[PDB]
Structures are given as C-alpha cells and as structure tokens.
Design an enzyme around this catalytic site. Sequence first.
Site, PDB file in Angstrom:
ATOM      1  N   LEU A 249       6.555   1.748  -2.360  1.00 53.25           N
ATOM      2  CA  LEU A 249       5.157   1.437  -2.524  1.00 53.25           C
ATOM      3  C   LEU A 249       4.394   2.616  -2.374  1.00 53.25           C
ATOM      4  O   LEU A 249       3.037   2.749  -3.058  1.00 53.25           O
ATOM      5  CB  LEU A 249       4.717   0.437  -1.582  1.00 53.25           C
ATOM      6  CG  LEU A 249       5.367  -0.872  -1.839  1.00 53.25           C
ATOM      7  CD1 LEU A 249       5.046  -2.040  -0.594  1.00 53.25           C
ATOM      8  CD2 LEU A 249       5.348  -1.478  -3.198  1.00 53.25           C
ATOM      9  N   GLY A 250       4.852   3.482  -1.674  1.00 52.42           N
ATOM     10  CA  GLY A 250       3.778   4.766  -1.096  1.00 52.42           C
ATOM     11  C   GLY A 250       4.379   5.525  -0.044  1.00 52.42           C
ATOM     12  O   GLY A 250       5.501   5.307   0.647  1.00 52.42           O
ATOM     13  N   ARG A 251       3.640   6.777  -0.015  1.00 53.68           N
ATOM     14  CA  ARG A 251       4.180   7.956   0.687  1.00 53.68           C
ATOM     15  C   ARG A 251       3.235   8.335   1.419  1.00 53.68           C
ATOM     16  O   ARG A 251       1.921   8.230   0.903  1.00 53.68           O
ATOM     17  CB  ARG A 251       4.671   9.079  -0.510  1.00 53.68           C
ATOM     18  CG  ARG A 251       5.011  10.332   0.016  1.00 53.68           C
ATOM     19  CD  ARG A 251       6.127  10.468   0.588  1.00 53.68           C
ATOM     20  NE  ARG A 251       6.650  11.808   0.635  1.00 53.68           N
ATOM     21  CZ  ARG A 251       7.786  12.269   1.401  1.00 53.68           C
ATOM     22  NH1 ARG A 251       8.753  11.232   1.921  1.00 53.68           N
ATOM     23  NH2 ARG A 251       8.231  13.545   1.330  1.00 53.68           N
ATOM     24  N   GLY A 252       3.269   8.506   2.566  1.00 54.62           N
ATOM     25  CA  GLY A 252       2.259   9.169   3.690  1.00 54.62           C
ATOM     26  C   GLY A 252       2.720   9.977   4.415  1.00 54.62           C
ATOM     27  O   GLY A 252       3.780  10.582   4.254  1.00 54.62           O
TER      28      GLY A 252
ATOM     29  N   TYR B 130       3.010  10.301   7.701  1.00 54.37           N
ATOM     30  CA  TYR B 130       3.811   9.784   8.781  1.00 54.37           C
ATOM     31  C   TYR B 130       4.665   8.699   8.335  1.00 54.37           C
ATOM     32  O   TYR B 130       5.600   8.292   9.186  1.00 54.37           O
ATOM     33  CB  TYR B 130       2.880   9.062   9.687  1.00 54.37           C
ATOM     34  CG  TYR B 130       2.151  10.147  10.590  1.00 54.37           C
ATOM     35  CD1 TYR B 130       2.972  10.905  11.716  1.00 54.37           C
ATOM     36  CD2 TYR B 130       0.812  10.711  10.241  1.00 54.37           C
ATOM     37  CE1 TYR B 130       2.054  11.950  12.192  1.00 54.37           C
ATOM     38  CE2 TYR B 130       0.197  11.901  10.797  1.00 54.37           C
ATOM     39  CZ  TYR B 130       0.891  12.366  11.962  1.00 54.37           C
ATOM     40  OH  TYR B 130       0.443  13.283  12.518  1.00 54.37           O
TER      41      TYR B 130
ATOM     42  N   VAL C   2       6.616   3.817   2.737  1.00 54.96           N
ATOM     43  CA  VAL C   2       6.606   2.366   2.713  1.00 54.96           C
ATOM     44  C   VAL C   2       7.206   1.762   1.507  1.00 54.96           C
ATOM     45  O   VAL C   2       7.006   2.231   0.352  1.00 54.96           O
ATOM     46  CB  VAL C   2       5.014   2.109   2.760  1.00 54.96           C
ATOM     47  CG1 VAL C   2       4.852   0.503   2.799  1.00 54.96           C
ATOM     48  CG2 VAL C   2       4.417   2.598   3.940  1.00 54.96           C
TER      49      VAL C   2
ATOM     50  N   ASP D 188      -8.745   3.571  12.161  1.00 54.60           N
ATOM     51  CA  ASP D 188      -8.619   3.919  10.717  1.00 54.60           C
ATOM     52  C   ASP D 188      -8.977   2.600  10.040  1.00 54.60           C
ATOM     53  O   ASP D 188      -8.397   2.259   8.768  1.00 54.60           O
ATOM     54  CB  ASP D 188      -7.068   4.076  10.718  1.00 54.60           C
ATOM     55  CG  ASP D 188      -6.777   5.151   9.491  1.00 54.60           C
ATOM     56  OD1 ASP D 188      -7.773   5.520   8.801  1.00 54.60           O
ATOM     57  OD2 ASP D 188      -5.585   5.236   9.225  1.00 54.60           O
TER      58      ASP D 188
HETATM   59  C1  LIG Z   1       0.866   2.464   6.369  1.00 54.22           C
HETATM   60  O1  LIG Z   1       0.832   1.465   7.704  1.00 54.22           O
HETATM   61  C2  LIG Z   1       1.052   0.245   6.915  1.00 54.22           C
HETATM   62  C3  LIG Z   1       1.217  -0.290   5.787  1.00 54.22           C
HETATM   63  C4  LIG Z   1       1.709  -1.431   5.347  1.00 54.22           C
HETATM   64  C5  LIG Z   1       2.044  -1.586   3.632  1.00 54.22           C
HETATM   65  N1  LIG Z   1       1.329  -0.869   2.962  1.00 54.22           N
HETATM   66  N2  LIG Z   1       1.289  -0.999   1.801  1.00 54.22           N
HETATM   67  C6  LIG Z   1       1.355  -2.326   1.237  1.00 54.22           C
HETATM   68  S1  LIG Z   1       1.597  -3.691   1.922  1.00 54.22           S
HETATM   69  C7  LIG Z   1       2.389  -5.061   0.843  1.00 54.22           C
HETATM   70  N3  LIG Z   1       1.101  -2.270  -0.101  1.00 54.22           N
HETATM   71  N4  LIG Z   1       1.078  -0.835  -0.343  1.00 54.22           N
HETATM   72  C8  LIG Z   1       1.079  -0.132   0.884  1.00 54.22           C
HETATM   73  C9  LIG Z   1       0.923   1.466   0.834  1.00 54.22           C
HETATM   74  C10 LIG Z   1       1.190   2.220   2.045  1.00 54.22           C
HETATM   75  C11 LIG Z   1       0.763   3.532   1.914  1.00 54.22           C
HETATM   76  C12 LIG Z   1       0.433   4.056   0.744  1.00 54.22           C
HETATM   77  C13 LIG Z   1       0.046   3.601  -0.333  1.00 54.22           C
HETATM   78  C14 LIG Z   1       0.279   2.133  -0.290  1.00 54.22           C
HETATM   79  C15 LIG Z   1       1.885  -2.473   6.273  1.00 54.22           C
HETATM   80 BR1  LIG Z   1       2.395  -4.130   5.742  1.00 54.22          BR
HETATM   81  C16 LIG Z   1       1.759  -2.221   7.647  1.00 54.22           C
HETATM   82  C17 LIG Z   1       1.488  -0.866   7.993  1.00 54.22           C
HETATM   83  O2  LIG Z   1       1.262  -0.650   9.362  1.00 54.22           O
END
Ligand SMILES: COc1cc(/C=N/n2c(SC)nnc2-c2ccccc2)c(Br)cc1O
Length: 334
Positions: free
Chosen positions: A44-47, A49, A52, A155
């Site tokens: 889903l994503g890259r951060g 820390y 995901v 945040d």
């Molecule tokens: C980064 O901390 C968290 C991210 C997410 C989900 N993140 N996320 C979703 S949940 C279905 N959908 N896209 C993203 C997402 C995360 C980071 C970058 C881009 C998208 C959840 Br449940 C709990 C967290 O504590």
Amino acid sequence: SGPVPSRARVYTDVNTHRPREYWDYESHVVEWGNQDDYQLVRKLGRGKYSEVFEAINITNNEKVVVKILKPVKKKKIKREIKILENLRGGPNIITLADIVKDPVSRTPALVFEHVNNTDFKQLYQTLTDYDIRFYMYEILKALDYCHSMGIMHRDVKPHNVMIDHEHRKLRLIDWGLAEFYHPGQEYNVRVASRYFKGPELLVDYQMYDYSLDMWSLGCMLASMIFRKEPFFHGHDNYDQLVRIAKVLGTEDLYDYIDKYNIELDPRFNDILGRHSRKRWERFVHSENQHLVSPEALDFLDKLLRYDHQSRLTAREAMEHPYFYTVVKDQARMG
Ligand SMILES: COc1cc(/C=N/n2c(SC)nnc2-c2ccccc2)c(Br)cc1O
Ligand code: NA
C-alpha cells in the site's frame, strides 16, 4: 527570560493519577503473535519508518493491514505499541490486532484491522456538508478519548484518518508520533506534518499539550470546507507560520509571542512581516459554499487560535451547534 510555562486546561493529571505501568512504556515487554498467520497481498505504501501492506489472516480469511517497522530503537516501538494497547476499543481508534516478528526483516510488524478506505478523489468530489459534520464529530470522539486517556496524537492529518464512506466508518491511524502527556514536560517540536503543525511547534514552544491536535483538526476542517488541501501550504517550517499569519494576522501572533515570552530570530520577524486578520468569509467561493455555514465558520474560528490555551477542547468542540444535526441523528433507541 525563558518562556512562560504552560499546562493543559483539561485532562491535566490523567497520567499523574494512573499506575506507572500505564505510561511507562520503556518497561513494556512485548508478547509476540505468530507471523505465519498472515500472508502479505499488496504493498500500500512506503514511509520513512514503515512499509504498509494489505494482508490476509490465513486462519480465518479476514483482511488485515500489516505495518512492517523499519529498524529503530526498541523504546519508540514500545511507545507506539503501549499507546495502541491503552486506546484499543476506544471510539474510532484503529484496532491493533496482533504484533509479530517479520520473518524476513526480523523487525516488529504491527497487524491492524482492515479499513476499506475510499479514494481521495472520489470523497473530494462527493462529500456533502452533512458528511463533513459527521466525520468531524467522529474524529472528535477519537481525540476526546485519547486525550482523556492522557495521550496526544501529534500527527493529525487527512492521511491519518481512514474513511470507508459506504459504511460511514472512520478510524484515526498512525500512532507512531503519539506521546503521554505529563504536565510541565518539554516535548519535541518535530512532530506533525508541516501543514498541520501548530504555531507552538513553529515557534519552538516545547511545553505544549493536547491542544496541538485541535490546531491540526482545524487545519483539516478548513481544508475540507474550503476545498483546499492543505489549507496552509508553507514551503518550510518558517514559511508555514508566514502562511498562517497571512490569514490569522500578525497582531494576534505577536500578542501570543508576548504572552509566553517567546523569542524569535530577527529574520523570522522579517519574513512574518505585518498582515491583517482576514475574515473566514474571504475563502468562500461558488465551488465550496455548499459546505460552509455560519456555524462552520464560528467553529473553525475557535480551533484556529494562536494561543493553544484558547482553542476548544475536543469535548467543547463536540457541543458546538455545528454538530447539532449529527448529535440528533446519533441519539437512537437502537
Ligand atoms: C502508518 O501507520 C499506519 C498505517 C495504517 C494503514 N495505512 N494505509 C492504509 S490502511 C487500509 N491504506 N493506505 C495506507 C498508507 C500508508 C502509508 C503510505 C500510504 C498509504 C494503519 Br491501519 C495503521 C497505522 O498505524
Ligand atoms: Na507471514
């Protein structure tokens, strides 16, 4: 000639009155689940820390979200885990389902309930006035709860509010910057997204509190009702305060600085210049006016205050007439 101290108006001593185990996250010992229960399905994503993923719990076919932590000191990881455990079950608080050791990275992976979140572009083209009031009220329930539980989120921003719109379902996520409030403590001001940082952060005032979250929420409200996300778009932290000052004015900014005896870099004054306070009505146009009412503007005005002590609390916000139709809807026999 340091700054004047400050403490939260509400929930001041929540952690003072709890057992040490509640807030002493360095002493938390993690009990690990089994990573082999979960199969990753899609990134889903890259951060910075974490990475995901959507995943499946293979023992029950339920979707989950897995946040694989990048390598970092145990203390930070324990803080987020403890906060998530403390808040679990709270209204609109994301549920931490499991904690596992990723078998490839050998770093902790946090497993959350899955939220089928609606894409941005769609929500932006379709949210009604009522939808905004409802989701604002639901965020406020999450913030009142976490504040009442002695925790600042730090945040609050659109990316951290997941909405499954067909189910009218919202969760406040990403608790990695969250911290326990203790009165008199000096906190790190390097929290929040640039565009959602309160003025306290931007002038390096470290003795802040829950009210930081209420600034951030007000930035979200303005972005939603005026259809401009982010509402205050600075190019760095100094310019962020400039963009705020161009709207709230410099008179009230300097009264705030004076109240707390805050010292600014002489260059900072320079770029801040001198600006009138603008009427909220200046941001209303034909493409957003359906989302704006006098109640929305009165409410926004009470969130977006320089002085953190003068912002509404989450519970005060919930009592605002802006939410009267939401409160009514929710008063149900069940
Ligand atoms: C980064 O901390 C968290 C991210 C997410 C989900 N993140 N996320 C979703 S949940 C279905 N959908 N896209 C993203 C997402 C995360 C980071 C970058 C881009 C998208 C959840 Br449940 C709990 C967290 O504590
Ligand atoms: Na696995």
